[PDB]
Design a protein around this ligand. Sequence first.
Ligand SMILES: *[C@@](O)(C(N)=O)[C@H](C[C@H]1CCNC1=O)NC(=O)[C@@H]1[C@@H]2[C@H](CN1C(=O)[C@@H](NC(=O)NC(C)(C)C)C(C)(C)C)C2(C)C
Ligand SMILES: *[C@@](O)(C(N)=O)[C@H](C[C@H]1CCNC1=O)NC(=O)[C@@H]1[C@@H]2[C@H](CN1C(=O)[C@@H](NC(=O)NC(C)(C)C)C(C)(C)C)C2(C)C
Ligand SMILES: [Cl-]
Ligand SMILES: [Cl-]
Ligand code: NA
Ligand code: NA
Ligand code: NA
Ligand code: NA
Lengths: 301, 301
Amino acid sequence: SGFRKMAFPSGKVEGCMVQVTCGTTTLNGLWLDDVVYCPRHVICTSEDMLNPNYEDLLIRKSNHNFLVQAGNVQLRVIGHSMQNCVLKLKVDTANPKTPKYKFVRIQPGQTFSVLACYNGSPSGVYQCAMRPNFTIKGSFLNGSCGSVGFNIDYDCVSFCYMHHMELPTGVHAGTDLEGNFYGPFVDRQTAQAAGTDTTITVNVLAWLYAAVINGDRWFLNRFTTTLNDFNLVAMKYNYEPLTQDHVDILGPLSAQTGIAVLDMCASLKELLQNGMNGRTILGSALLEDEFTPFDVVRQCS
Amino acid sequence: SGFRKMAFPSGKVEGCMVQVTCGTTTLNGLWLDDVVYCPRHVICTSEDMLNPNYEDLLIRKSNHNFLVQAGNVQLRVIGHSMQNCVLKLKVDTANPKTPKYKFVRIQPGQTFSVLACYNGSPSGVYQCAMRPNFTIKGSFLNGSCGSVGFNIDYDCVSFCYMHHMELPTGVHAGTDLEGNFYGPFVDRQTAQAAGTDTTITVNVLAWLYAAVINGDRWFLNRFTTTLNDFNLVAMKYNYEPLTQDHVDILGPLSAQTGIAVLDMCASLKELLQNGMNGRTILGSALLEDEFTPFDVVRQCS
Ligand SMILES: *[C@@](O)(C(N)=O)[C@H](C[C@H]1CCNC1=O)NC(=O)[C@@H]1[C@@H]2[C@H](CN1C(=O)[C@@H](NC(=O)NC(C)(C)C)C(C)(C)C)C2(C)C
Ligand SMILES: *[C@@](O)(C(N)=O)[C@H](C[C@H]1CCNC1=O)NC(=O)[C@@H]1[C@@H]2[C@H](CN1C(=O)[C@@H](NC(=O)NC(C)(C)C)C(C)(C)C)C2(C)C
Ligand SMILES: [Cl-]
Ligand SMILES: [Cl-]
Ligand code: NA
Ligand code: NA
Ligand code: NA
Ligand code: NA
């Protein structure tokens, strides 16, 4: 049946993206009800961003400084406030294409679909994990700020990410829709380091079930281990500790394949000590850690 | 700025997906104007599919055998015809969410976004290449038939794939919207083999430019080669021959990075003869061949 990195359909989110412009600076906004959310550095010049004072910059702006465009339709801004690092523009018209939506803050390890946008126009959609060090390995050009990360539960859009900035080596940082950064980052153009990144162990295990579901069985061994013995080896290879909550959450996949989680931990223990000896798993020469159990159940059922 | 496998936003296509049911058998349809396109084996029982006679099966059906559902709204079928392996249901209502659309037949090597659907409901979106042997490495469960492949040019949806069936090892086959199979395949449940798959050389080269754009330079060498010398080595590793049309098409990327195509061919020649000596390129331990030049320009500009 096959296994691909797969994103949520982007339609409901597409109908929310607008272009916010303040002077020269123009980026993307999320239009929900009568509010446009965007990163607050839309009110900066290239120089302000080297060491901004957003409060100072925003007092100086009036409602009229803000050009919001939804297609060929302008939008009268009739208010503005700043929630942490996001800007909130009250507008005369409520968005008729506003879906049921929630704002959530995701945990490191959870995945989400990025709708990458330029000039308030949907360009493309891909899947990302929130890394342990609170970065994402996205793909963002200049103009992509405002682009959002989301998940869908049935009809409800769970917005969890808005893109702000890029760190050394094409890794990325942003906020929830409360305007709170993920990780210890600030919307200021000064040297900031990420913190070492770990491998999301529960996610690798989820992917090995995907592999088995799909007929890749070669790594399966006749052993189990204890959580304790497994975590002593994993710690050495910079894998996250596997908790009992991780085991419980892997339950469905264990049930779908009839392979106990501690048997699959036996397989992973061996792959870390020996590598793959020139062997692939779902076509990858590396262990893949950006598929959650919830992603695997979804796509393999 | 980063480099991810990225799909077109799926909104315009989302508004076209319906559920077609004939007896027990129910799959997805594409609703465009007053026509619903779906795979023709919707009129089969599990047993008919072992050796169908579609003409015989379809004569027996009347317009009323066909249940088309668009949300909670049924749709009066008022006609039916069969174009090769696709079924065309004329319906009383033209789809108001019908985008500008084209039907195109893609070449092996070209990429497209799959909108994977179950019960006429968009489930997820991913990117695929048409392989040299006219298969795709998709992810499709039972119920996914009718799901479509597309590209977007500005406002125009270029529909090129409709999913029919799965071959040995989670590879997939389908038709254009004329109902013509890609590859030598038939919509019948009997043993069929794929034909050996080659590596899309021009696509690997496109991806190496992506790598260089993104700061992965380690494989860059001080050599050029001739097309001829390169194709003599590539032929041995089951890489497609690189044509002058391939070189011409790589032009923009060569221009964006100031690396001649025959210099990058010098790099690739070395990677095939030596492998990567435990080195990654954009995080991959393998050479990636499912990004077209047109995909790389897009995402790296
Ligand atoms: C901005 O949001 C936009 N309108 O697109 C933009 C996003 C993209 C620029 C290129 N890649 C992107 O992700 N964000 C910025 O330009 C932010 C903005 C100003 C600097 N900045 C950056 O992303 C810089 N990174 C940076 O300073 N990194 C450190 C690790 C902090 C040194 C830049 C050098 C431009 C990529 C703020 C307000 C942070
Ligand atoms: C069908 O379109 C649907 N309603 O979902 C379905 C698609 C998915 C089944 C599982 N994976 C899919 O991609 N297609 C079929 O069931 C088609 C259908 C009947 C058999 N068939 C298959 O895909 C089979 N493959 C097959 O027979 N492969 C050979 C190489 C030809 C032996 C099956 C064994 C069910 C996966 C036709 C009309 C071909
Ligand atoms: Cl993928
Ligand atoms: Cl990817
Ligand atoms: Na103000
Ligand atoms: Na105000
Ligand atoms: Na008939
Ligand atoms: Na008829």
